[PDB]
Structure formats: C-alpha cells, structure tokens
Amino acid sequence: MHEDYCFQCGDGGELVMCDKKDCPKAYHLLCLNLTQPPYGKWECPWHQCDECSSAAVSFCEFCPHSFCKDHEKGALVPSALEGRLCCSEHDPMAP
C-alpha cells in the first residue's frame, strides 16, 4: 500500500514511507535532505502547504506540492488523467 517510486523525483530505490493514515507516498532520503530515516512515526511533506506552515487542504496528485486554503487559489488545475489536480510543474495534458 505504499508506492514504488519517490513522489519527489519519480525514481525507485530506497524509499522512506509516510506514516500518516491512508498516505501511500514514499521518498528518497536524498530527496528529503536526510541522512537516515526519521526516527519513529513520520509525516511526509505532502501534508504541509508549500507556502506556509499550515496543513494542506488541496493537493497536487503528481508531486508533493500542496496548499492550505490561504494559498490554494490558482495553484492547481485538473489534468487529463481522470481530472486529477496538478500543480504548475506539470503539463495538464500529460501530467
């Protein structure tokens, strides 16, 4: 129930897995600027707004970008893949 590729860079390898309920995301230590897996239960960066410390309420489905209500305006648009939201790093026609 965790993905087989790093949500930040998209490649496989050694991945640390998110502990937040229902989150399947996993990441390279290097992509998290870490040397070892965090100690104990860990919450991945997807749940925090890109622009502040608030919890995210809207999410890019293609990378860890996500946004609180204060910062969500204009940040995400539907993509060709079932309408799943994507941030400005992706081509919505081929996310």
């Binding site: 390898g13 050694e14 991945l15």
Partner: peptide, 10 residues
C-alpha cells in the same frame, strides 16, 4: 519511519 527497497527505472 520504515524504508523499503524498490527497482530503479531506465
């Protein structure tokens, strides 16, 4: 946190 080992691409 737990880690796992998966295959690299390309």
């Amino acid at each position: 946190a737990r880690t796992k080992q998966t295959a690299r691409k390309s």
